[PDB]
Amino acid sequence: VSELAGHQTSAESWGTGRAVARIPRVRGGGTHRSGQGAFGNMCRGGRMFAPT
């Protein structure tokens, strides 16, 4: 699997104090994929665990 898969996005997690639970989320925009969650194996999209 390509090493750029799940890393072309630029996401960092929102800090503590909001109802979301510490996941690296998409930064802003009037888009469906905005504050959703990336850079994890549990999220839709994102990186797979231990990429081959």
Partner: peptide, 19 residues
């Protein structure tokens, strides 16, 4: 299209005591 996020925005801070 679906809106931008704006949750409950950080409730009212209190005074901080000493010792």
């Amino acid at each position: 299209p679906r809106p931008r996020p704006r949750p409950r925005p950080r409730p009212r801070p209190r005074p901080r005591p000493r010792p």
